[PDB]
Amino acid sequence: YRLDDQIGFILRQANQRYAALFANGIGNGLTPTQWAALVRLGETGPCPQNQLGRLTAMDAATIKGVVERLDKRGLIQRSADPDDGRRLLVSLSPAGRAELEAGLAAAREINRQALAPLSLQEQETLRGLLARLI
């Protein structure tokens, strides 16, 4: 039992390295999860907050605060669920849409650097193996 063979320690370190490349590379001052929620709201259009959470592996409490921090920046809009007036839908602002487009190149670059230690073949193997551990 050595620590450096434990897959949890390894996962954390890969996670920490990614966090470092992302903070260095993204250019818009957003966190990884802030970006994930922004990206996802661009895919979905108007979406319940907790559902947005469940599509980005985020808690109600976690997504709550990501969306609020995204709000403080003017990047989201809220509006009544048309099928349930007790309910809110979260959507990308025009500025939040422009932020997404302005961030694509850098997010692509952060992702390419994360995988850089690996050949394009190896990247595919890793993504497949790691997808099964999600």
Added chain:
Amino acid sequence: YRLDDQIGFILRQANQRYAALFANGIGNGLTPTQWAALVRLGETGPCPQNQLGRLTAMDAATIKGVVERLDKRGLIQRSADPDDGRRLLVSLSPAGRAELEAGLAAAREINRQALAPLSLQEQETLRGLLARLI
């Protein structure tokens, strides 16, 4: 640009799953990093707190944090660095050494469950591929 393809999203989810298996499986109420620090002090013996951090990918404030919580549970002992009396060394308690032993089985089991979706050869491939993304 689909989110589910981004290695950052994938890493976070693999990490959250590991966290869930670990909380379910450890049996002694320690976090992954608390456990990592504990395991590492078993390997190193008396060791400076900041060096302990640099051996477990934890910065000064982070390593400070888990050592204090480890101390609250009676699992560590502090003593003066014999080559530098300004300095402290951190070491396992008898109780902390017992905790490590009592925890080995479950940490092994958490680790095997984490990797369970993969064949024993696929694990080796993944461990190798991931090592290089650390």
